[PDB]
Every structure is written in C-alpha cells, then in structure tokens.
Design a protein around this ligand. Structure first.
Ligand SMILES: O=[N+]([O-])c1cc(C(F)(F)F)ccc1NN1CCOCC1
Lengths: 112, 109
C-alpha cells in the first residue's frame, strides 16, 4: 500500500510549534527549524485560519479525545496543500503542568 | 532526578504495532536509536510477565480508540528493563497508533 506522507508535531495551547518531526521535509518541504517557534496558523490559508484557531481552542476542552481538522497548508514551494491534522492533548497526571497538544499532520485529498 | 519532559518520549506505530517513528529522547532513557526500532513490533520489548496484560491493552486500544496502559516493563537496549506507562491513541483516516510513553524507573537488571 502507498504510505501516507505525514509528520508529528507538538504545540503549545496557543498553536506554536514546540517540536517538529523531520518527516516534515518530505510532507511540506520545510526543515523543522523553519517551523519551530512559529504558530501553525502562519502556514494556513486565510480562509482556514479561524477554523484552525478554533480547533486548537476546542481540543483542550475535549478531555484528551482526538480532534481533526482539514486545512490548506502553504508548502515550501508556496503551494496550498490539503492537510488533515489530528490532535489531542497530553497532560502527565503525576504533575499539574499545563497540557500540550500532539498533532499528526497528513497530506490528504479534498475529494471523495 | 529528571524533569517530566526528559522522561517522556512519543512513538508512532502501524496497526500491526510495528514502530514507524520514535522520539530521540528514547536513546538517553532506554538506549535505543529510533532507526533501529523501525519495523519491530512493540511486543518484542515487553517483559514476559506483562505480555498477556499488554495484549489486552492493545485489544482495548483497537476497540475503543484510546487506552492508558498501566505500569509495565520495557526491555532496555543493553539488558534489563525500565518501568513505564503509556497513553495510546488510534488515529483514523485506522491509520496509526500514537503513544506517549513516560518512564517510571531507572533501568533495573
Ligand atoms: O505500540 N503500541 O501500540 C503500544 C500500545 C500500548 C498500550 F496499548 F497503550 F498499552 C502500550 C505500548 C505500546 N508500544 N510501546 C512499545 C514499547 O515502547 C513504548 C511504546
């Protein structure tokens, strides 16, 4: 089977990339360093940015369940690629440290 | 003494439980290089006394979509075992399993 192209990222609750898996180079064409420290919304099509902000806001309310969102991500070649980001929060209950958001980001088709 | 993040590593698995990705943090904790884990099933690494319970947890994960593992022992690269606990999540397109792994002990030989 043809394997999906995807990469993992960690974000703070605001959406800033705090960790980026190197599989991002093949998925969207950027080096991890080009994403780290930026908000995911900075790579998102203007029509999708608010949905993406809403999603990050809601995943924290959903009790560690998975949220997904589909949006247009600007690749390194300045082309809009459809991405499906599936996100969930992680909080270590030995602590009261703030949860962060774990994402898996896959290039998908906007079609049936 | 270590902080929380230094004892946490994320792994990704295909639905056959084989590693498809692992955080480099695992090297400092357990000894493995991520590249050497790829294509090996999670089951290769569980202590014998935890194997039946882990099978049940994997079954619960696949049935329900998420699971918390309880405490189990993972085989360390240079012998011995480390206690850890895992939160597992299936990502459905099922595409893969994400595991957040937290180390609970030093390596015990
Ligand atoms: O792979 N997986 O599907 C794993 C599932 C799991 C569960 F089901 F949550 F208990 C616990 C551990 C799992 N994998 N390990 C294997 C050893 O390194 C840590 C991750």
């Amino acid at each position: 089977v043809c394997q999906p192209t995807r990469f993992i990222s960690r974000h703070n609750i605001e959406g800033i990339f705090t960790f980026v898996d190197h599989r991002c180079v093949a998925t969207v064409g950027y080096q991890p360093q080009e994403l780290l420290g930026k908000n995911i919304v900075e790579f998102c099509h203007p029509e999708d940015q608010q949905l993406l902000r809403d999603s990050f806001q809601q995943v924290v309310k959903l009790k560690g369940q998975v949220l997904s969102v589909m949006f247009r991500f600007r690749s390194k070649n300045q082309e809009w690629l459809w991405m499906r980001t599936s996100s969930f929060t992680f909080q270590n209950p030995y602590s009261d440290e703030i949860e962060y958001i774990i994402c898996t980001n896959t290039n998908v088709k906007n079609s049936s | 003494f270590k902080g929380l993040d230094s004892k946490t590593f994320l792994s990704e698995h295909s639905m056959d439980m084989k590693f498809t990705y692992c955080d480099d943090r695992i090297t400092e904790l357990i000894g493995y290089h991520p590249e050497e884990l790829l294509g090996r099933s999670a089951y290769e690494f569980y202590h014998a006394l935890d194997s039946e319970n882990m099978t049940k947890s994997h079954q619960n994960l696949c049935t329900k979509g998420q699971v918390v593992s309880g405490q189990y022992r993972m085989l360390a690269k240079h012998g011995g075992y480390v206690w850890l606990e895992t939160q597992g999540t299936v990502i459905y397109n099922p595409q893969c399993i994400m595991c957040v792994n937290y180390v609970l002990s030093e390596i015990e030989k």
